[PDB]
Amino acid sequence: ANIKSNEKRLRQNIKRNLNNKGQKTKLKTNVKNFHKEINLDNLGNVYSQADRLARKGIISTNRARRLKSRNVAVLNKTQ
Amino acid sequence: MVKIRLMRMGRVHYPTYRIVAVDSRVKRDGKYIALIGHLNPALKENKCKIDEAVALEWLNKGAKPTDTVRSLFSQTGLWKKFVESKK
Amino acid sequence: KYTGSIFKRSRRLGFSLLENNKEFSKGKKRKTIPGQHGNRFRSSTMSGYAQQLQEKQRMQYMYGITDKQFRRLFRLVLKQRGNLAVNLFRVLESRLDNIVYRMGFAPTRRSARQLVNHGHVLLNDRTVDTPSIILNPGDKVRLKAKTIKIPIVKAASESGVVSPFVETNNKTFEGTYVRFPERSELPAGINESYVVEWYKRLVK
Amino acid sequence: MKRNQRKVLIGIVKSTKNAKTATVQVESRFKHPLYHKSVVRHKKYQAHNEGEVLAKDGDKVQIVETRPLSATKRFRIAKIIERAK
RNA sequence: UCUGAGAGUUUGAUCCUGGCUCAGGAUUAACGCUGGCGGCAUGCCUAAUACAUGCAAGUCGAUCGAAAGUAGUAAUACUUUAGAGGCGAACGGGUGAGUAACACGUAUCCAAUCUACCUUAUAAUGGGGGAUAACUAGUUGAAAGACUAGCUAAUACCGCAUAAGAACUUUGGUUCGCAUGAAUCAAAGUUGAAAGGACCUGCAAGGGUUCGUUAUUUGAUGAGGGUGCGCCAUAUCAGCUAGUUGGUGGGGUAACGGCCUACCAAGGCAAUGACGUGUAGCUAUGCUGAGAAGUAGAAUAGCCACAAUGGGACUGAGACACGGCCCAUACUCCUACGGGAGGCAGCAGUAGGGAAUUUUUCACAAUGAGCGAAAGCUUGAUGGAGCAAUGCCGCG
RNA sequence: UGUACCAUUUUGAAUAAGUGACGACUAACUAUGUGCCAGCAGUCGCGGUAAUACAUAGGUCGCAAGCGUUAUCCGGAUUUAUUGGGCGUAAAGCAAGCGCAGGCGGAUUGAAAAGUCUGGUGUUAAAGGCAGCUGCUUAACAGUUGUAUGCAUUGGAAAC
Ligand SMILES: [Mg+2]
Ligand SMILES: [Mg+2]
Ligand SMILES: [Mg+2]
Ligand SMILES: [Mg+2]
Ligand SMILES: [Mg+2]
Ligand SMILES: [Mg+2]
Ligand SMILES: [Mg+2]
Ligand SMILES: [Mg+2]
Ligand SMILES: [Mg+2]
Ligand SMILES: [Mg+2]
Ligand SMILES: [Mg+2]
Ligand SMILES: [Mg+2]
Ligand SMILES: [Mg+2]
Ligand SMILES: [Mg+2]
Ligand SMILES: [Mg+2]
Ligand SMILES: [Mg+2]
Ligand SMILES: [Mg+2]
Ligand SMILES: [Mg+2]
Ligand SMILES: [Mg+2]
Ligand SMILES: [Mg+2]
Ligand SMILES: [Mg+2]
Ligand SMILES: [Mg+2]
Ligand SMILES: [Mg+2]
Ligand SMILES: [Mg+2]
Ligand SMILES: [Mg+2]
Ligand SMILES: [Mg+2]
Ligand SMILES: [Mg+2]
Ligand SMILES: [Mg+2]
Ligand SMILES: [Mg+2]
Ligand SMILES: [Mg+2]
Ligand SMILES: [Mg+2]
Ligand SMILES: [Mg+2]
Ligand SMILES: [Mg+2]
Ligand SMILES: [Mg+2]
Ligand SMILES: [Mg+2]
């Protein structure tokens, strides 16, 4: 009543979830740091992490795009 | 990922196929997109009444044929026309 | 599959197989409706339904046809162009065993049917076993060869008495048929066209 | 260029008692399925008076569909003929 | 060029209004009597009741370490796979419970969207690092397993150098649109990639084909949303609705959106039928009718919804996933009493309900599907063969 | 699957007929028994000691590897009448009036073109229906070609 393919897929996606959760938390903390101490330097890090996640497919590329756009809007408004 | 393939509309102990442009994931004997031409295994001669126009259009669009379909295109000579139009 | 009392049925309907072999007989020359209640009054004034049914029964017993086959043939003929009073007569007369009878190679229609079922008959370019194939004038219905030597072949090859609408080319038993039978060749046993209307009502 | 054209509806404003809205009403003469006679119907669509159009009560207004601005709001106002009320 | 038949019955007898009944077709049919065969087609309409048992999605050693077996003095050759990895398991198959509404049919708008493999075209595929499966040893057990410490490999994972073109912005131009608003530049700033395998040649160096990978470009298919119209009965259901209606800022979603949030307002639907109750998957179609249309939504095909009941989520292009995962409920079963296992509305089959509806079968041989270069492998999809006068047709 | 099918292969009518009805609608009648009893029935209705309606037999009729009975759906039913009915005496005109909304509405001119008519285009999946043809010994069946309806857009007509 069980399939080796299904079991192996579960065992793989556990590790994949761990790694992807780590990356997403890193992105969250970087964007939070940017918003906390707004500075044009942190926007670059936000860009890098969002783009890397969007390529890897962990995050939706359109969400990465909207994050970039809204952070740039905040920066342009403040400067 | 449309795929020119066959489809059965015969009866018990008497098959009859139709070459048709249809999607990969849709069941055999289901819904299709464009009709190419019928075929009888026991038609002796001219077993595949081929169209040669919308079939070429769909392979130009990127349809992936099957083994039997490629064979049918081959005896008539549609594979030559496709390859030379590609070139 | 057929009745075994053709004498009784011929005496009831009043019409034999166009030869009166089942009416002349060798006894009593009886031409009355069968059963004890045969010599009674109330002869005419048959209802419309009664006479339609009697005529239909005569028609579909003259050839040994099941009523369901009759409905099938009528549904086949009805859709075409228009008034097919010249087409459905050919349709009814085009039976294979009937054509064998009018060919003259069997003593009786159902005996010809038995021979056809047993496979002593050929076709234009094939062989036929079922005694219901619809024929068309032009097919060379050549008879078998191993059936020409059977102890009962004399009256079969004595086909010189033949209908004009079946042409044999005598002594060659080619037995084709052209010049479809007319109402003259379809005698007064059943010559009516409101059986068509009865089947129009009872069959859509 | 070539651009697909939206569907249009012409109606008369029935009420307007909110912020940037106008509940317009559109009539139609659909035939009856069986007795085959025209029947007058009434449906109250909604639109927004974003600006430059105002379109107060009693104003005969043309209406063009749009992507949904909110729940139950999918229409916007356009040219206004017979300005009254 | 369509195209329609009637009769019996109230009276002592007649005419009319008027109800009942019959003559014709048809079914996923059942029952009684009887029964020979063949060609096609159909065969749990009830308990979305419960299930014993055996099968129903795997594949690749031409991605990778190891292990085993057969040969070989050895070096080594061949075969096989427990495991890592890639792709597929979201297709295909079944059922119609739920659902009276954008569920479905039709016509459209997506200036408000996504799309793996596929098609066309265009740049690269350079160089490093840390780990863990398999294995070893110990603890715990009958075993399932589980925990702890070391050892490895890559097309697994993470950095770095580099952007032909990409994404997000700045500067002004172009052409403008349907109101938000889209389309194209020239320059600039910021951000951003990966992986090699097989084989051939070449003393070597090097070169080459192919599969595959990263970044793009073109279509196509597929998925999602919005709207007009059509789509049951009932007034012996007259008010319903407080995220309900609208506005501002922000968040979230592939996307617009009270989808969500904080603030400010009181609106929105409703006698042209809201809301309530009952019932039902919708459609192409089947049967009937001269026609308008009546009726059932067999088989099959399109779409929707479900997988014992009720929720949540990971991976992924795509699921909130029938035979993947977590939790609760109910039920059944195993135990050596600590703990566990389970979901036939997949193919046969059992119990039960019923008037009533079948093999506990063979083959991937063709068609189709997935992996693979092929060898092939898997395919209860599919093709056959059993059973049944269940229906049409045919013969005795 | 040694299956469909074929042959001068041995034997041999040998291996094969039921069901309903018979007073009228509805094609098809006599006798025996019972005697308002036993029973039949879709409707009218049969049975009270001469039953063609009950039970049996004989005969005959309708179908046939099927025949009857039951259930449901349509027609016949113009019996919810748009096509296609009625309201004095047969079911049906509110007890009468003032009347909002709705339905209908005098004559002529102009404009537009929402209904109406017509041309082009897109679509209405395949299968199914109808017409033609081919293949199964013909058929049932399979395949193949043609074949409408509605919606939307655009271009004209202006009688209502
Ligand atoms: Mg607004
Ligand atoms: Mg708003
Ligand atoms: Mg009387
Ligand atoms: Mg069921
Ligand atoms: Mg292995
Ligand atoms: Mg599925
Ligand atoms: Mg199926
Ligand atoms: Mg239901
Ligand atoms: Mg993938
Ligand atoms: Mg390494
Ligand atoms: Mg990698
Ligand atoms: Mg970098
Ligand atoms: Mg009628
Ligand atoms: Mg169905
Ligand atoms: Mg069903
Ligand atoms: Mg269950
Ligand atoms: Mg994901
Ligand atoms: Mg299962
Ligand atoms: Mg699964
Ligand atoms: Mg089953
Ligand atoms: Mg196969
Ligand atoms: Mg049968
Ligand atoms: Mg028959
Ligand atoms: Mg009786
Ligand atoms: Mg009697
Ligand atoms: Mg009627
Ligand atoms: Mg009735
Ligand atoms: Mg009347
Ligand atoms: Mg009265
Ligand atoms: Mg009065
Ligand atoms: Mg009165
Ligand atoms: Mg008045
Ligand atoms: Mg008024
Ligand atoms: Mg169609
Ligand atoms: Mg057909």
UniProtKB/Swiss-Prot annotation, chain A:
Gene3D superfamilies: Ribosomal protein S20
One Pfam family recorded for the sequence: Ribosomal_S20p
Domain of life, per lineage: Bacteria
Gene Ontology biological process: translation
Keywords: Ribonucleoprotein, Ribosomal protein, RNA-binding, rRNA-binding
GO MF entries: rRNA binding; structural constituent of ribosome
GO cellular component entries: ribonucleoprotein complex; ribosome
Listed InterPro entries: Ribosomal_bS20, Ribosomal_bS20_sf
Keyword presence, rRNA-binding: yes
NCBIfam families associated with the record: S20
Similarity comment: family membership: Belongs to the bacterial ribosomal protein bS20 family.
The protein's role, per its UniProt record: Binds directly to 16S ribosomal RNA.
Entry protein name: Small ribosomal subunit protein bS20
Gene field: rpsT
Curated annotation (Swiss-Prot), chain C:
Record key words, sorted: Ribonucleoprotein, Ribosomal protein, RNA-binding, rRNA-binding
CDD domains found in the cross-reference section: S4
Listed GO MF terms: rRNA binding; structural constituent of ribosome
Domain of life: Bacteria
Pfam families membership: Ribosomal_S4, S4
GO terms under biological process: ribosomal small subunit biogenesis; translation
GO CC annotations, alphabetized: small ribosomal subunit
Listed SUPFAM superfamilies: Alpha-L RNA-binding motif
Domain S4 RNA-binding: 94-155
Function: One of the primary rRNA binding proteins, it binds directly to 16S rRNA where it nucleates assembly of the body of the 30S subunit. With S5 and S12 plays an important role in translational accuracy.
Assigned protein family: Belongs to the universal ribosomal protein uS4 family.
Assembly: Part of the 30S ribosomal subunit. Contacts protein S5. The interaction surface between S4 and S5 is involved in control of translational fidelity.
HAMAP family: Ribosomal_uS4_B (MF_01306_B)
Protein's name according to its UniProt entry: Small ribosomal subunit protein uS4
Organism taxonomic ancestry: Bacteria, Bacillati, Mycoplasmatota, Mycoplasmoidales, Mycoplasmoidaceae
Protein's gene: rpsD
Swiss-Prot record, chain D:
InterPro entries hit by this protein: NA-bd_OB-fold (IPR012340), Ribosomal_uS17 (IPR000266), Ribosomal_uS17_bact/chlr (IPR019984), Ribosomal_uS17_CS (IPR019979)
Signal peptide: none
Subunit-structure text: Part of the 30S ribosomal subunit.
SUPFAM superfamilies: Nucleic acid-binding proteins
Family: Belongs to the universal ribosomal protein uS17 family.
GO biological process: translation
Keyword presence, Transcription regulation: no
Residues spanning the membrane: none
A molecular function GO annotation: structural constituent of ribosome
Gene3D superfamilies: Nucleic acid-binding proteins
PROSITE patterns: RIBOSOMAL_S17
HAMAP family: Ribosomal_uS17_B
The protein's name: Small ribosomal subunit protein uS17
Record keywords: Ribonucleoprotein, Ribosomal protein, RNA-binding, rRNA-binding
The organism of origin for this protein: Mycoplasma pneumoniae (strain ATCC 29342 / M129 / Subtype 1) (Mycoplasmoides pneumoniae)
Its job: One of the primary rRNA binding proteins, it binds specifically to the 5'-end of 16S ribosomal RNA.
Pfam family, one: Ribosomal_S17
One GO term describing the cellular component: cytosolic small ribosomal subunit
